[PDB]
Amino acid sequence: MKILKLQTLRGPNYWSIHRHKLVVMRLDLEDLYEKYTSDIPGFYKGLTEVLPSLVEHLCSPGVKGGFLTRVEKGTLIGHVIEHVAIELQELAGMPVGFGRTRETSTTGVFQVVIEYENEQAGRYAARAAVRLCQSIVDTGTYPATELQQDLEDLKELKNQASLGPSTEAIVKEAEARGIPWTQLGARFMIQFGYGVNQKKIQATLSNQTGILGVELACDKEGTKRILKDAGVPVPRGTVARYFDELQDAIEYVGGYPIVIKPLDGNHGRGITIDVKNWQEAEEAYDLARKASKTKTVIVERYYTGKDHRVLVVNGKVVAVAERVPAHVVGNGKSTIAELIEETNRDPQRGDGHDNILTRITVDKSALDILGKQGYSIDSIPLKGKKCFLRATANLSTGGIAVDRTDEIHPENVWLLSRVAKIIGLDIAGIDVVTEDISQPLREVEGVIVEVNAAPGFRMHVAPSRGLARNVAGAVMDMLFPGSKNGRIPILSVTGTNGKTTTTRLLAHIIKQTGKVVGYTTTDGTYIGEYLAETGDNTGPQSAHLILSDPTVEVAVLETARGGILRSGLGFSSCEVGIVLNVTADHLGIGDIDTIEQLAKLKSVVAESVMPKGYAVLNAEDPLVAAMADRVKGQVAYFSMDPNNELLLRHTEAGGLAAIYENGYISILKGDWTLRIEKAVNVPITMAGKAPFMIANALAACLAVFTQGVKIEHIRKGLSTFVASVDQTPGRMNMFNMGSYHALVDYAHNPASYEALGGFVRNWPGKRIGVVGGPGDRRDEDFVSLGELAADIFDEIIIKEDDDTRGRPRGNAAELICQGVKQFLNGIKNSESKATYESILDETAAINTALDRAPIDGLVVILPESVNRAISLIEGRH
């Protein structure tokens, strides 16, 4: 076994839709290629003793233990490998239930697809499955120590790539509302929505949470001063840094009892709660001073009453929880000694940062605290009354929370909303000390102890003594007020031969409307009028740049098959999904070997259209038109032939099609025809000479029309879009230098070659052509390119791309020469005797083409890089 390639899919992909997280591996079965499990000695027993849990795999039999029966009858090792990967990452607590195995075109390599929950965990499970199976086939068993090591590694990977419970809850709510979410790579920040409609959270702080409010909340004395200036009942306190100031401060606060705490600390380090005389105040002051990071200590009046935590979101009180400290009740005539471990044996209690109820930790400090209680270990509680173990009233110690949201007085709700607004926090956690939350804080001597930014709502979604509150729902309501997701209109263009031109035309048409358009094409990624990134930029890694930009209002993405194969789609759904054509030209790349597979791959865009969205399909292409079914949302057809029976039948019942009827780009809305332009006033069509450009224009116009763009804007965008170097880098570019003309294009496959010929053959001048193709394509494609170039052109100059993609140098050139020779030998008389010659350098090829251009001739260039041809023709004026 040898792992040849390991890819991870994060969106809708070729293998599945709605199963976004997948991992696909090319596994080489060098020696066990046709060895079934029944033909491997001792394989079944070793496998079933290493992992008995496989008995739960309801395989193709569909019954409990069916996979075991499949192994019994003899099965290929790829199937057991995918199953062992599923079970290996399932034992680590990660439920996954998708798996596939396929035979590739090459002899000994399989493709194995495993569902994952964590990317690193999924890759690790895929890598470990083959090692486990190889060890079983070599020795008959797998060591238990290695199995435990692998499970521990998987659990560590799951823990490492995990959000927090607050972020988990908020992300789960956003997913439930259909709002897209992505993980930023900087500071554990999560981005919701797209473009101008996006928001950001870290754990509870949002992108609208103020720096000033957070800093004021972190400052205890500043918060107290601000709240006192606003009439909020804060505790009467003072600060002190030297020993001699203690007596004066205690006089100022109003007597006894008092509270001594540090200015800065964590988990209540060195905070005394209740002191009533001198000496204990002195030791508490010493402890707090040695616990504070700045030697300074708050001393305030002690206020009796229970401790409540009030959560305020968007100025509204969402949840109120009373914090009861760790305690036991002897109502069953049992004392502390039994109950301390009786409570610890309850499944609700747990450690870590997931189970909120913690075990009652009997610390030495806790022993001292229960010493101050006035009772002992075996002292039975009187009458069955609460007896406490600590006084901090915190969940970490082992206390409980009681829901009090339905009992808070309306005046208290108003006061706490005012406190949150005064501090300046959109989400705040306010600590109140009061004898009764159902009465106003003025009647009882209730006080506001502190205000916390980025509070944890972990005690409100699981009170354990009351009703849970949907805090994540309130946060998501604050982030997205109405029934609004964070989506911007997404238009995904896919197809074999017209993605870039259609994407640019769509971007121009939408730019006619006053909107900022972020679009990614083969040339580069643009936002508005300015280039955001250079390169290929046709995969999800460039779609994320557009979808995360804060200024983009409409996203237009050219979605090539390469990105879908590599890592799937960069988005869950698209508003418009355009499929232009599917031609079997570059077959053999990846697992794609038949045009049916290519159609299935390109259908991912069509099947990703949301139910309220549109799928713009070419009715003239049978494979693309076959995608009409299995598409959620409406279908709109475009056809260059106005008499297409399928399109007419579609328009009769419903509408939303586009045709080219009588020198007119027309939209059919059922029984209504709306003409846009004469198709000779559209510059890219070149006075209607290029039909493929007209098809691209039809697709773009239909796509914008389905989204409500006015006909006037479509007309203006279609008229003002130019097919020259100013806008189109290498798409149908004319260059005129007087004596002749230069056509630079991007043709590299037989379909685009035929489309190019359909326009070149109408030129009345001499036809010189420099042709070529990428080196990673099949030989038959090169032969077809050569024969088509022979058919259409009069002078042939064959060049092979410098980046040959692993193919030996030259081979493609002589095979295109073989194709042109075959076409030449297929002619009896001198009907077309085009001259042929091959030079393998781009500069030499274009120089030779431009050197011997006669009067009124046409020289067509199909270079590896557009910038080379652009610069070469710019230098020569």
């Binding site: 509870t204 964590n266 980025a454």
Partner: peptide, 4 residues
């Protein structure tokens, strides 16, 4: 700090 964090999740106060």
């Amino acid at each position: 700090d964090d999740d106060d």
